[PDB]
Amino acid sequence: EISTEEQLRRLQEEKLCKICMDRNIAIVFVPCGHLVTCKQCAEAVDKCPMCYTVITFKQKILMS
Amino acid sequence: EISTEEQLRRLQEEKLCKICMDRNIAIVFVPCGHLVTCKQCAEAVDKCPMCYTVITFKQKILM
Ligand code: NI
Ligand code: NI
Ligand SMILES: [Zn+2]
Ligand SMILES: [Zn+2]
Ligand SMILES: [Zn+2]
Ligand SMILES: [Zn+2]
């Protein structure tokens, strides 16, 4: 946040699954709208691990 | 070889709505899954600008 390097790092890390930080986020949870997980990490959850809202759909998204 | 600053500008630009390029992307199109537009510009499209798939739902994103 307080330097260009940190800004760059933030935007790079922002793309990654918040659970494994090994793969890009590839799922948006409906209805809550959180971008949290890659496909692999989303497999195990029935509620959003950020807000705990019941997930009615795991929509695949393209994040590059 | 690309400067920290140029890499940063590129990623920032990547985040911008592909219609207005003023606000950040804020919507995911169902079912194609493309992230294309901010909330305001999503009102104007009935097909995804990237793949032309008919949009059945516009899901707001939260990061
Ligand atoms: Ni790792
Ligand atoms: Ni403008
Ligand atoms: Zn993951
Ligand atoms: Zn959530
Ligand atoms: Zn826009
Ligand atoms: Zn599309």
Ligand 4 centre from B4 Cα, in Å? 32
* Method used to determine the 3D structure: X-ray
- The answer to whether B16 and B10 are in contact (CB under 8 A) is no
- The answer to whether A17 and A61 are in contact (CB under 8 A) is no
Ligand 1 centre from B39 Cα, in Å? 33
Helix (H) or strand (E) run with residue B30 in it: strand B27-30
Least Cα distance to B32 among B11, B61, B59 occurs for B59
- In whole angstroms, give the CA distance from residue A18 to residue A26: 11
Resolution (A): 1.8
| Structural domains of chain A ordered from first start | 1-64 (3.30.40.10)
- In whole angstroms, give the CA distance from residue A10 to residue B20: 24
Cβ contact A62–B7 (<8 Å): no
Cβ contact B7–A5 (<8 Å): no
What's the N-to-C CA distance of chain B in angstroms?
Answer: 30
Residue B25's Cβ-count burial label (10 Å; 0-12, 13-18, 19+) is buried
